[PDB]
């Protein structure tokens, strides 16, 4: 019973925007609050600005100490690639690279992994080194985490302080903080709970047909659904007229809302009490069962 | 500007009577325009009532007495208007 189907595929290049949902690898769930220009965030003595600012106060409450260790490794990891970046930028000879990389992969305790770059190649070694520029990738088995002393030893291969915290300068201030702060390289994910498609609002549109209330859902211009708990919450205040207004004009009274819509554009803000026809509808349904129900007077 | 209503509450010893009299007063300003009784700072009539009530020169009965004297004045004015209309033919 159908002639044709037309399928259209459309694409959106959607970027980050404040209010989005952001997370890492250790349940440190969060939300981007504000985007600020580059100079505002603190920067090291070497001029490099930090990218992500996180609240330390989530650590002791949630006992997520492991992300601190991962941060120390990330600072340690990126330190290796930078010097390699320094070495290759000044076009040094490959054997100088080799032993240095040979220093990296033989470091630590008696790990089962053994490699020898002298048996690989020359040009493939150079290609690996070029691919190695963005930090030397490291891994750890799940229940075989490298000890803290090993982390410090790998830091000694780099040229960073042993304790793993740096003095920072704030662009607004331009002075050292009283306590040094730990920085590093975190791995961050991204979540499909985008803020933009969560955002929705509805001034006035279509209504239901069986009854006369607005619909729900971001599609087809749905409205917010007012539940009972907050009805009693208003009832806890003296919010009489607010509750009556919101439960009659902007929900059910078809003639009432039209009059107010005329009133609003005319500068009047006087509510017109009416008759909730949803109650009338229910009334008729009660009348449907052959039991007489009626309103006594005016 | 205006931030709280505590002064008006301590003036009129009922939060519920406060909102009622303020709503009435703001009704006479916004619809059927009269003047405010206090200099404004580019704000709508709702805030203006709070200024007026907190200055201790509007309460429920002040509105009541003003409205009844205004209505008897306009009733009298209607009386002279009707008599003048009748005397127009005379």
């Amino acid at each position: 019973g159908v002639l044709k189907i037309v399928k259209v595929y459309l694409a959106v290049k959607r970027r980050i925007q404040p209010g989005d949902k952001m997370a890492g690898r250790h349940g440190n769930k969060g939300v981007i609050s504000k985007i600020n220009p580059i100079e505002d965030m603190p920067y090291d003595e070497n001029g490099t600005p930090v990218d992500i600012v996180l609240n330390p106060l989530g650590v002791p409450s949630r006992m997520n100490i492991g992300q601190i260790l991962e941060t120390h490794l990330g600072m340690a990891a990126k330190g290796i690639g930078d010097k390699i970046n320094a070495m290759l930028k000044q076009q040094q000879e490959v054997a100088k690279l080799r032993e240095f990389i040979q220093r990296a992969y033989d470091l630590g305790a008696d790990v089962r992994q053994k490699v020898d770059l002298s048996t690989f190649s020359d040009e493939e070694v150079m290609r690996l080194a070029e691919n190695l520029r963005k930090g030397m990738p490291i891994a750890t088995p799940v229940f075989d985490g490298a000890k803290e002393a090993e982390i410090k030893e790998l830091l000694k291969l780099g040229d960073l302080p042993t304790s793993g915290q740096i003095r920072l300068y704030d662009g607004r201030t331009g002075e050292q903080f009283e306590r040094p702060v730990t920085v590093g390289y975190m791995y961050m994910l991204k979540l499909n709970h985008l803020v933009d498609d969560k955002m929705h609002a509805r001034s006035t549109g279509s209504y239901s047909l069986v009854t006369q209330q607005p619909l729900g859902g971001k599609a087809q211009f749905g409205g917010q659904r007012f539940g009972e708990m907050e009805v009693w919450a208003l009832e806890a205040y003296g919010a009489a007229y607010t509750l009556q207004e919101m439960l009659t004009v902007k929900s059910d009274d078809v003639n009432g809302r039209t009059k107010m819509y005329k009133n609003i554009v005319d500068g009047n803000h006087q509510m017109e009490p009416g008759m909730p026809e949803s109650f009338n509808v229910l009334l008729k349904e009660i009348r449907s069962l052959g039991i007489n129900i009626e309103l006594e007077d005016e | 500007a205006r931030v709280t209503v505590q002064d008006a509450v301590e003036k009129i010893g009922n939060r519920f009577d406060l909102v009622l009299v303020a709503a009435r007063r703001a009704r006479q300003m916004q619809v059927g325009g009269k003047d405010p009784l206090v200099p404004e700072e580019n704000d709508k009539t709702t805030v203006i009532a709070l200024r007026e009530i907190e200055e201790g020169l509007i309460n429920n009965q002040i509105l009541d007495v003003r409205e009844r004297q205004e209505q008897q004045e306009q009733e009298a004015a209607e009386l002279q208007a009707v008599t003048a209309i009748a005397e127009g033919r005379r």
């Binding site: 009832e235 205040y237 003296g238 919010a239 009489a240 007229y241 | 519920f16 009577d17 909102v19 009622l20």
Partner: peptide, 18 residues
């Protein structure tokens, strides 16, 4: 007949329905 509407209803049952 709980919050501000009590003042109205206080008039409501007093004037009429009494």
């Amino acid at each position: 007949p709980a919050g501000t509407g009590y003042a109205y209803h206080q008039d409501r049952m007093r004037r009429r329905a009494a």
